[model samples]
Target chain A: HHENLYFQGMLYDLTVVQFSKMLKNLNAIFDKAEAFAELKKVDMDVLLNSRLAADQFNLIRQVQIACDTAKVGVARLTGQLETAPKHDDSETTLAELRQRIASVLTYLEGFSEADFANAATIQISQPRWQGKYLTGYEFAIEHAIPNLYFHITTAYGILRHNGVEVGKKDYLGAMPYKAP
Target chain B: LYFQGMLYDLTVVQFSKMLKNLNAIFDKAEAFAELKKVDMDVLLNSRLAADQFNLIRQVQIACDTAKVGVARLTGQLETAPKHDDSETTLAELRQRIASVLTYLEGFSEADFANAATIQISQPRWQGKYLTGYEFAIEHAIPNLYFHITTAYGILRHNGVEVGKKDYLGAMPYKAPIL
Candidate 1:
């Protein structure tokens, strides 16, 4: 009781809950885009490769990166999954993307409070980034959280720009929350 | 050290950093919007879809959430500043954001250290209650990130040329590519 009183909150609430909600939102966005492509009678591939800018990752890559950052970020922190999940960028079809999200969701569902007990002490690294290894907490905040949102938001931007039907509420999913 | 010992996540660090990044992203967005000669009204009125709030209202709400979130936790005097639909220019909206960041910076970590158990009643519409911990994690933090992300979405959807670095601000101990 004093712990709850003195402690800000639990790690599960911060990382796992956030990722779960993020996955839910990502699923909804994908479903919306799928329906939108069917309604417009456009090839899903066209929408899949759609991007807001030349430099930014395309829709497919955006989803891929979002999934990777969340899944691998957690795996590294928890030391749960033995090997990283492989998701090539070419897996652009709606069915394939749906499967990708499902697999990651499955992996994510396996995490419990104890999975993250050593999280703060775990040193996290990425091949693309070197000379600076972050602890699980910093990795989640600095890399994973920001990267997850960046890709997810960019994915939303692509669909919205290309006329897929979604809104801020869609991106946010149901808030386990209320306003005062 | 008390917080670290108890493992209570620091609200002051998170909120302060969030507001700072919010300002950085908005500033870069404004600079690009001007250079592109994009009409200020067009950018302000833009949304991810018809159902979402526009950029101006999003910025207004984002500013409100940060200020109010901090005030609720810290007992800071609420300024509750006004932002009418009257100011349509990009500069006016940017000024509004800057003012909110200034207000948020007034409090220190001590202000939020004891905030965990603060009882926060929902708006008349919500008709619920939450501890300050729940409020920050479930409501305030999400709301802050949503509006900021939506604001970024609006600018990028309209072709503002902003990138991930703009939104992420500076990378910590960034290692250059070999």
Candidate 2:
């Protein structure tokens, strides 16, 4: 009953499908922000720099970190750290943020199930971990998925707090439903 | 090659860790309430939206989703621990979280042997169903994260001192011996 395919498939959905849909949702959230800005005659930077707490990362950093979490999660799991795209984190404007997300989505498209052949057992360590490491499976479940959602949800909250017309459905994005 | 049960168990572990982190976040919320001299019920009843479940219900549903998810995936739904949803205090809510964490501990890799091909459905689906794998990925895991994150966001929006590290809980970090 042991098979690598199952783990790889899960990773693909978690990293690619989950990340792509949420990133698109984030992009659409910005669309609402754009419309909000236009209607209220407020600058987008006001929303971009806003945060739930005074000490927390603002909406811009949230989006950047979400993108990085997805790309880096996939790359680290697949042992393709070098292949993952790097950003200088210079995104400030909405367009630049959108482009950063689009770049990560494109980078994700480069991976397939084959790229994750040994992913489940792959020993993954970051400099922050010192010498200890989580198996690829543990890293995906423990670190990647939760971290991705935390930032994305926070970003969503930031916009919703600022009176953007987004809601829970916007954060959830699309689902696969079959007709009964 | 990896056992499907191993993967399923890890999914449960993820849920358990999240609930623990969530419990810790609530600890902070309680401390925040005490420090600010605010009523705990006010924080418990908070919600990001008027239509959404308040923080108390969010924690309850998160607990339900985690335990029910494990039970359904492992074909033990009937015997899964049940809660009366009567929890009204932070202490009660933490007790519910602890109860689920304890129930989740009852499972091991062997309990999820059939997880890969098992079909799981809820009555609300109109008979539509998901394979255990689909249920784990599409419904269970994401649904769990959704409520947990919502709970976190509600507290954060209210000025709780919790942060990402608290949300992530303890990582498996080991320092090098000098």
Candidate 3:
């Protein structure tokens, strides 16, 4: 029955899987970036600061924001914002960025289906919303998922634009295909 | 509960909203193209990689993924709208998106009654399958976002003024009470 599919559990499953997996995908892209830097004899900072536009965040900030969007999204939905791990935004190297991603992954691992039991109904707001709020469902769908991908995709774009060899498969990461 | 009987919200609702937002992003692109005296086809023909689909095809696949995602999860794939990927202009691409949005509008909560239990596969899957839920989570939703994000990245990389807010689209904001 449709009623049997709990929205909270679905949110938990989505946030945990997509956020964690995409972070890992982002990490793998960085691994390629590291090799590309070595292969090209380019300094790592050049790739780290690369961006699509003058106004956009550099690659490092993109990675940082993506991590924040994932961790903070889950924390706010689960009412754990005050306890969510804080990053100082000081990361400047590929290893540092990967460590940030790893920390967020570890944070995401701490959540379980039970942590999201009331997520669908939770009223989520940021100061930017000016007191308006998204119910947790809206936060997840409209905010978290899209924001995470935007930065991750942008991060991927920055590296790709710099002539890194990453492609769609790198962006998609591993998929769980079952044999017939 | 507010979410009861809407197990497909993530697939149906999110897909529809993102498609609409995608259409709006193209609107901004159209404006940018006109202001700069650039041909819309140039932008439509652009790609992030030499080997990847161009902007038009990316929009096409994102649209297909959304509509087909809903159709498959709801077991209505046969009736889903079909497109030939012949959109060579921004207008044609927007029309395709509108067509998918219209098809998506035809579904209601009850249409996904078996969504979680249904198993889904494409011919490309070669007999492997995902549970409808897994299809939504693993393939459909992420695939949709990837193409759309790629589309955005293509335009943004080419100097379109679209930003993170544009990609996120309109928010459900209420004015603060004094």
Candidate 4:
């Protein structure tokens, strides 16, 4: 099993959920502010819970730090952001996801049509082997991506499971494609 | 409407809840070198019970870092981890929680449920009023367990594959969720 691959991918999924949810919470607050009205009861929970959620990640401490956590969550995979080094919370929309994805792509080493085109050659840590290593890119396109999908799926499953409104578009966001 | 002990208990409950969820996340998930990413929203969502299990190792470390008057426990939470506690950093929480769990895995079940006989050598913020050993014996236990159990429940409720067995990760006799 591509456990490590799946694990890292899973982390990516988790980060995405949090980043997206953060945006939703901010929008809720903005709604209250823009409307010059108090939040609804459920909306209050959303705002309050989001405020608390900020505590969970240590986000209340600093905006960049919070954003960095998300960027790094994916960065550990693709790599860290070069041009945009800071995790800007000011970014509050689909753009945030795209920007975060940009960071993850840093480590990917730029997938070639044949590379992503053929299959992925991933490096993974074996379970029973203990401190041993295995090369598994071909398997990744097969096992790992699917495994990534599983974690990503579970990540999506969890959000949708909890009512985040994710769909096929989300699931296919990272999938590779070649245009004519 | 709450006493010093009440606020203390709330912090304790929050701490315990964070730990339990921490354990559950680590137990159910595997870590990979490549992506190094994992998902735990189900266990740490704002609505889900798992959110309580969510931790802020950064804050936990910060709170521990401001380790003034309180008696220094054998091991210290004094070290501040490199991270933030922003509303959007749930993924970071998951990372910190995993790190804590991995360290915890090395210990026996007796570790978590063990008693805190030592008094934290610190002053009672308001006064030079020193809470005696009786305080640790009396208040700390409930506080510790309260947070630990709540953390555990958050994890279990969500699909972390944790139960009575793993609940006793470092400590012995972790009480089940009520």
Best by DockQ: 3
TM-score of each: 0.80, 0.89, 0.93, 0.27
The DockQ of predicted model 4 stands at: 0.01
Q: Kindly list the per-residue Cα lDDT of model 3 for residues B32-147, writing each as its tens digit.
A: 99899888888888886676678989899999988888888888866667799887877788899899888888888888878877888898778887888777877787788888
Per-residue error at B168 for model 2, in Å? 1.2
Question: Model 1: runs farther than 4 Å from truth?
Answer: A1-9, A37-43, A79-82, A175-180, B1-12, B26-42, B45-51, B73-82, B174-178
State interface RMSD in Å for all models: 5.3, 3.1, 3.4, 26.4
- Ranking, DockQ, top scorer first: 3, 2, 1, 4
Q: Which runs of model 4 end up more than 4 angstroms from their true locations? A: A1-180, B1-21, B29-39, B47-91, B94-125, B128-132, B170-178
How would you encode candidate 2's per-residue C-alpha lDDT over B1-178 as one tens digit per residue?
3445555655678789999999989889989999999899999999876756799998999999899888888888667777999999998999999999999988888888888667777887787777777677767776788789889888987889888888888876544443
Q: State how far residue B134 of model 4 sits from its true place (Å).
A: 3.5
Q: Tens-digit lDDT track for model 4 on A114-153? A: 2221112233343444544333332222222222222232
Considering lDDT, where higher is better, how would the candidates rank from best to worst?
A: 3, 2, 1, 4
Error of 1 at A129 (Å): 3.7
List model 2 lDDT by residue over A54-107, tens digit each: 778999999999999999999999999986776999988998999998998888
What's the true lDDT of residue A177 in model 2? 54
Which candidate achieves the best lDDT against the true structure? Answer: 3
Q: Point out where model 2 deviates above 4 Å.
A: A32-43, B1-3, B174-178
